[PDB]
Design a protein around this ligand. Structure first.
Ligand code: HEC
Ligand code: HEC
Ligand code: SF4
Ligand code: F3S
Lengths: 54, 449, 396, 25, 175, 54, 27, 147
């Protein structure tokens, strides 16, 4: 009550919670990128110079 | 002698330790600016050294095929050993109920965190493929590969990580009450709310000090075997190998004693100017320096005991390789480091036995400097000399360090001192609530006569 | 005081029983007598040496636990000269007294003329390489010099502690003992390390360990700490403890027992992992014999009964504050310490768990009984807790 | 408060399911 | 409405004042001091902190997790033979360090986080701070407060009881 | 995955053609028999590093 | 209080399912 | 195997998987008997170089061979300090040629060309062992023997 509003007690705890979620989301995004079909070029029909149809 | 001399008051401790921080930026003393300028210059030397090491490679050092570990490991063991004494002061003395840890635990622990931060770069810098350091960490990968966990470098990764994290959370727990005292004296509104969220709104009260004291007791009781096991693992990395000079069974305690030896030397070297510059002669008295030099002398004697055990082992066994190890140390091409070892950490530590020398400040500064040089020479003798001449005589060569690993050394000194100068500028360098509690305890003791 | 007399009578009865069955085993077999007497001397030496070391350590760093058992540490350390006379039988073994007393071959390998002399029938170059150092004259001289140092330190400290009860306790008789303990600590570390090298490690001249000896100091420290906790529980109502001793010294000694238990486990594991991972053939035969012919079961029992069980029990704030519970744990620790020394010394002789004879159990009890009897006589000689001591204020 | 924490959880669950779908897109 | 304040000047006065209360029967009272008094602490907060049980639980989990990770990783999932070292439980050497370090980490984290959570420490705002001289509470200026949650709920009598005790200043702390 | 558990993916030598061929319902029994008949080595060797990397 | 303990519990298992999916049955 | 300069050999960074050692021994030492001895990887069944690499880049093979995998080495250089015979060579810098086209044409396509920061040692010419094993397995299944 000296230098802080009343809502800060809730915000501070919520901020710590939000921080943990953001950290977990960061690792998640990292792993999804290194296993995606764009990074590994999976299910991507690479265009050939002569357009050969198997 | 007494550990707290004058008739200090709780407000005397609060104002005297709080006046070092919270000083307006335009009122910063010129000595801090000169020291920070020197530390920043050496930090730029560090940046140039690391940049060139990344661009060219670890081949810029003097490491070769026989000596695959040079100063990139010596400076690592030296730095990681510097923080053992501060961890002992901030944790072991808390369990021992020693009253001379109240005025130096904050600065010492800060030295541990900064020394661990400096030592944490060599395991990445010396890698040769540094960006793959995370392969030593058990992480989910697209391959299915695990670290070996039977090598000592895997133990080393887990040890440094645990040591750094536990020392950081213990330091922050100890800083919380000082954060509260700072946000109570911060005056300015935006200097407040910064220490306020750092103090987490401490509101120093009962039902809170009880859990604080018990958690601090548990944390110190846990961090004591932590730092012991850390330096024991930094000893195991050489002791696990088959190198004649490296497979020595007394390495774990010898390394622990040597770490706290060099740590007390660095702490005395860095706390004497801190004591004599700020008006802290009432808190860091001469009895502090006396007992610290006594602990340093005891650890140095344990190191000399380790020297004798190595010599007895070389003379006791009939192995050609232990005998040649002793001969290569005594009269080899690198015998200069062994002679400097024997002069520094064995002859120069003897004057600490007496009382007049133990109460002299310049003698303590010179002895601490000589001890630090001898500790670097001891790590050199253990690693380089033993690695130069192995079992096959054809695989013998000499190790000559280059300029870049030296540049990394001075650079690590600059980063260490930059972090220390920032710490003494922002945060209080002496734990305040522990000092006023010590004053209250001395008042109660004088009441009971 | 009456409890101390009962302990003295029990120690005398255990000593005379052990000596009697030891003499019976000697008449049945003269060699096995000396083989067990070495182990008994090694295990009984831990109480006086650990008492002297802890006395000098608590003098350097004064505390409440140090003032609580200062007189008990002095009484335990004052038994060292009698222990030196008890070394005479072992010295007779490795001297020319063999071929008499029933010893066909000398008690130690480095004392057999067929081994250390070049051109002998059993010449071993590794053992003979140490022929000037490992000699009966040199070993006896080193042992006698160590005993002169130990007896001089213990008797001088005890004499100064007795004089402290007369006058001048603040200016002198407290700083003098501190400085003597300061130099004595380094002296005691060197002497005990080489004593452990000479008596026990020299049984197999093919193997050496640098950490060894320091393992012996931590082992002797744990034994004398559990012994102090037992004797504190015995004399807890001597009208001197009741008025000057609280639960804080008992809690500190319990914490010291816990710290020395994890310290001993840390040293033993350190030696094991260093020898295990580096599979050098010059250090492997030691851990081969201790893991063979059933000796592995002894090591596993030490791993659990002497580490995990004490570590978890003493982890709690209780069981160390209560003197009764701490004494019960100390008794289990003492029993385990006996087995640990058996695991280190007995394999060299018996080479089988079943080959362990009755004398291997007789000698430890027979010699510790004499140690307890002399300790009880020395503690009844003088009053406990030196009232005239500047550190006595730490008990308030 | 549990309401805000559950709300922040449902947001993290939605964001992650979108990221997981974008990986196998 | 939250409570009343005392602002006792010396630490010994806070001890005596807290002992004057409780005897009166006032409960749910807390005392604020710059340093742990160790005398007020035993009067109003005697019992288990709750930190130890968290440390032991997480520490044993940490040690078990480290041993399980090593055994599964190198002796089950991918059984690599390295230097002829055993792939059985006979590889129990070289599994102690990782296990020990993992247990210490979890136990230490639990103690620090537990002290914060158990105390409800993340509280930047508290009604107590509204009292003007509580800014000086960190520099001397010891305090004592009786909350409205006290069953007595005396209000003015509580202020008068605090006035009977010797206060530098009595204040009515509000939300 | 195949090197450690080849019973699930082995086929009875109709690989060049029979793109329409699909694993039979009793693939485990047929797979174990095919591994024994063709002498597919156990996972101890097939998981070695030098089988692939050199 | 008890509500937020349940909230930080559901948050934890949510993350585990998320993470376990990515590092196991994802590819 | 790459070719380093004279400057890199002066610092003891020659890359050779096999070496011959002469030892000039005997009386006089001015008319000495010369003893030539070839040394490569001994392929130790209990290889001390494998119990020290934290990333498991050096393991043992089913056939008793010592597998040294380049793409896993992080370069701790500990695998060499524990080698009693010192038969492991490290790419302290970038030694393999990249720009010259003719040198790229000389490389053997069955062996990876090492980059900076990895270790090398004698592999019993594993490319020939793998080729013979594959040929033996293929000849065994084509005849229906599973031998
Ligand atoms: C024996 C224990 C090993 C070791 C030490 C490594 N492998 Fe493998 N590997 C195989 C394939 C097809 C790849 C390509 C992966 C991809 O493209 O995503 C790999 C890759 C690796 C790596 C990663 C290299 C890098 O990221 O730079 C590593 C570190 C590695 N390997 C080491 C194939 C196999 C295989 C099946 C035939 C087996 C068995 C191994 N590898 C074994 C090992
Ligand atoms: C299942 C469809 C498989 C996939 C996916 C991969 N491999 Fe394999 N491999 C498979 C079989 C049935 C065999 C025969 C085993 C035997 O003992 O005959 C193999 C074997 C190999 C070999 C040769 C074995 C040897 O001893 O030299 C190699 C070199 C090999 N496999 C490599 C390899 C690589 C690199 C793969 C990923 C791209 C891979 N295989 C996948 C079945 C299957
Ligand atoms: S690299 Fe050295 S230690 Fe390893 S297998 Fe080859 S010779 Fe043996
Ligand atoms: S230590 Fe290992 S990481 Fe490479 S340098 Fe040796 S194979």
């Amino acid at each position: 009550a000296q230098i802080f509003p009343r809502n800060a007690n809730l915000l501070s705890r919520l901020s710590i919670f939000a921080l943990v979620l953001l950290v977990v989301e960061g690792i998640l995004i990292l792993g999804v990128y290194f296993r995606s079909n764009y990074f590994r070029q999976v299910n991507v029909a690479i265009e050939q110079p002569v357009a050969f149809s198997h | 002698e007494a550990y707290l001399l004058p008739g200090e008051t709780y407000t005397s401790i609060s104002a005297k330790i709080g006046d070092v921080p919270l000083t307006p930026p335009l009122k910063t003393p010129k000595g801090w600016l000169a020291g920070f300028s020197v530390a920043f210059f050496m930090l730029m030397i560090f940046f140039v050294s690391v940049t060139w090491l990344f661009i060219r490679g670890v081949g810029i050092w003097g490491i070769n095929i026989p000596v695959g570990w040079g100063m990139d490991i010596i400076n690592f063991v030296w730095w990681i050993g510097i923080g053992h004494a501060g961890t002992l002061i901030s944790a072991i003395l808390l369990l021992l109920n020693q009253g001379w840890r109240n005025s130096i635990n904050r600065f010492a622990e800060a030295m541990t965190l900064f020394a661990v931060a400096c030592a944490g770069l060599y395991p990445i810098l010396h890698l040769g493929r540094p960006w793959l350091f995370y392969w030593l960490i058990p992480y989910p990968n697209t391959h299915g590969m695990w670290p070996q966990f039977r090598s000592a470098l895997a133990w080393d990764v887990f040890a440094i990580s645990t040591y750094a994290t536990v020392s950081l959370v213990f330091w922050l727990v100890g800083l919380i009450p000082d954060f509260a005292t700072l946000r109570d004296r911060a005056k300015n509104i935006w200097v407040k709310r910064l220490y306020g969220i750092a103090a987490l709104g401490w509101r120093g009260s009962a039902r809170h000090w009880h859990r604080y004291e018990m958690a601090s007791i548990l944390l110190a009781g846990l961090s004591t075997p932590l730092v012991v096991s850390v330096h024991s693992i930094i000893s195991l990395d050489f002791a696990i190998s088959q190198v004649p000079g490296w497979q020595v069974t007394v390495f774990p305690p010898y390394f622990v004693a040597g770490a706290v030896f060099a740590g007390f030397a660095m702490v005395l070297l860095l706390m004497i100017p801190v004591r004599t510059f700020y008006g802290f002669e009432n808190y860091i008295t001469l009895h502090h320096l006396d007992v610290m030099a006594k602990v340093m002398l005891t650890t140095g004697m344990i190191v000399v005991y380790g020297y004798f055990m190595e010599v007895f082992a070389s003379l006791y066994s009939g192995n050609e390789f232990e005998e040649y190890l002793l001969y290569n140390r005594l009269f080899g091409p690198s015998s200069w480091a062994y002679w400097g070892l024997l002069f520094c950490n064995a002859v120069a530590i003897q004057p600490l036995w007496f009382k007049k020398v133990r109460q002299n400040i310049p003698a303590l500064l010179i002895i601490s400097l000589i001890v630090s040089v001898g500790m670097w020479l001891e790590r050199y003798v253990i690693i380089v000399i033993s690695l130069e001449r192995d079992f096959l005589p054809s695989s013998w060569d000499i190790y000559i360090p280059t300029i870049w690993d030296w540049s990394l050394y001075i650079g690590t000194f600059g980063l260490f001192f930059t972090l220390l100068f920032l710490f003494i500028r922002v945060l209080p360098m002496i734990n305040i609530f522990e000092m006023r509690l010590f004053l209250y305890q001395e008042t109660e003791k004088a009441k009971q006569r | 005081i009456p409890q101390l007399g009962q302990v003295q009578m029990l120690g005398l009865a255990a000593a005379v029983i052990g000596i009697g069955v030891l003499a019976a085993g000697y008449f049945l077999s003269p060699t096995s007598f000396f083989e067990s007497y070495i182990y008994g001397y090694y295990v009984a030496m831990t109480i006086p040496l650990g008492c002297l070391g802890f006395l000098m350590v608590q003098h350097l760093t004064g505390g409440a636990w140090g003032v609580t058992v200062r007189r008990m540490l002095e009484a335990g350390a004052a038994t060292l000269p009698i222990m030196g006379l008890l070394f005479i039988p072992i010295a007779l073994g490795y001297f020319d007294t063999y071929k008499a007393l029933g010893l066909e071959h000398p008690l130690y390998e480095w004392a057999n003329p067929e081994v250390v002399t070049p051109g002998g029938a059993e010449f071993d170059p590794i053992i003979a390489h140490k022929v000037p150092w490992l000699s009966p004259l040199w070993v006896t001289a080193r042992i006698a010099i160590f005993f002169i140092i130990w007896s001089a330190l213990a008797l001088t400290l005890r004499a100064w502690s007795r004089q402290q009860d007369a006058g001048g306790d603040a200016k002198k008789l407290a700083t003098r003992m501190r400085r003597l303990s300061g130099i004595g600590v380094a002296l005691f570390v060197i002497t005990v390390t080489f004593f452990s090298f000479d008596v026990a490690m020299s049984l197999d001249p093919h193997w050496f360990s640098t950490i060894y000896g320091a393992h012996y100091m931590a082992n002797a420290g744990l034994m004398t700490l559990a012994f102090l906790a037992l004797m504190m529980s015995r004399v807890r109502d001597a009208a001197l403890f009741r008025e000057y001793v609280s639960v804080k010294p008992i809690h500190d000694i319990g914490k010291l027992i816990f710290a020395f238990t994890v310290l001993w486990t840390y040293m033993s594991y350190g030696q094991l992992v260093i020898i295990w991972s580096g599979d050098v053939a010059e250090f492997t035969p030691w851990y081969v014999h201790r893991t063979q012919h059933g000796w592995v079961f002894v090591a596993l029992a030490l791993m659990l009964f002497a580490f995990a069980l004490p570590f978890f029990v003493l982890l709690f704030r209780g069981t160390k504050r209560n003197l009764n519970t701490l004494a019960t744990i100390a008794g289990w620790i003492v029993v385990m310490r006996f087995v640990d020394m058996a695991w280190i010394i007995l394999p060299e002789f018996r080479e089988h768990l079943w080959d362990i004879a009755i004398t291997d159990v007789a000698a430890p009890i027979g010699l510790i009984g004499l140690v307890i009897a002399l300790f009880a006589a020395n503690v009844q000689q003088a009053p406990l807790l030196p009232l005239r001591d500047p550190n006595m204020e730490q008990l308030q | 408060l549990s309401r805000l924490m559950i709300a922040g959880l449902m947001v993290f669950l939605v964001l992650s399911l979108v990221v997981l779908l974008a990986g196998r897109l | 409405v939250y409570g009343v304040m005392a602002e006792f000047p010396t630490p010994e006065a806070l001890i005596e004042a807290t002992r004057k209360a409780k005897a009166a029967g006032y409960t749910k009272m807390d005392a604020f001091s710059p340093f742990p008094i160790e005398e007020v602490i035993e009067e109003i907060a005697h019992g288990d902190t709750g930190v130890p049980r968290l440390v032991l639980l997480f520490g044993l989990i940490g040690a078990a997790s480290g041993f399980i990770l090593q055994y599964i990783g190198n002796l089950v999932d991918y059984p690599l033979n390295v230097g002829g070292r055993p792939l059985d439980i006979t590889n129990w050497p070289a599994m102690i360090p990782i296990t020990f370090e993992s247990g210490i980490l979890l136990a230490s984290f639990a103690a620090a986080i537990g002290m914060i959570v158990l105390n409800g420490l993340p509280s930047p705002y508290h009604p107590v701070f509204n009292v003007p001289r509580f800014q000086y509470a960190s520099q001397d200026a010891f305090f004592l407060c009786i909350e409205a949650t006290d069953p007595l709920f005396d209000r003015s009598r509580t202020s008068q009881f605090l006035r009977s005790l010797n206060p530098m200043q009595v204040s009515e702390v509000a939300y | 995955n195949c090197h450690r558990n080849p019973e699930l993916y082995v086929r009875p030598r109709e690989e060049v053609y029979n793109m329409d061929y699909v694993p039979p319902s009793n693939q485990l029994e047929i797979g174990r028999q095919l591994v024994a008949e063709y002498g597919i080595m156990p996972p101890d060797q097939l998981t070695n590093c030098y089988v692939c990397h050199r | 209080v008890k509500p937020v303990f349940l909230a930080v519990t559901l948050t934890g298992m949510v993350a585990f399912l998320l993470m376990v999916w990515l590092f196991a049955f994802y590819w | 195997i790459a070719v380093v300069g004279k400057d890199q050999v002066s610092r003891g960074r020659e890359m050779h998987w096999i070496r011959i050692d002469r030892y000039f021994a005997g009386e006089d030492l001015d008319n000495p008997s010369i003893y030539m001895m070839p040394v490569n990887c001994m392929q130790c069944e209990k290889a001390p170089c494998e119990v020290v690499c934290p990333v498991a880049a050096t393991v043992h093979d089913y056939e008793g061979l010592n597998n040294m995998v380049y793409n896993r080495c992080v370069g701790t250089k500990y695998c060499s300090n524990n080698c009693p015979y010192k038969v492991r060579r490290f790419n302290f810098l970038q030694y393999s040629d990249t720009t010259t086209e003719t040198f790229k044409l000389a490389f053997n396509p069955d062996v990876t060309v090492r980059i900076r920061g990895v270790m090398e040692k004698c592999t019993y010419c594993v490319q020939r062992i793998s080729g013979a094993r594959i040929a033996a397995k293929r000849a065994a299944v084509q005849a229906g023997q599973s031998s």
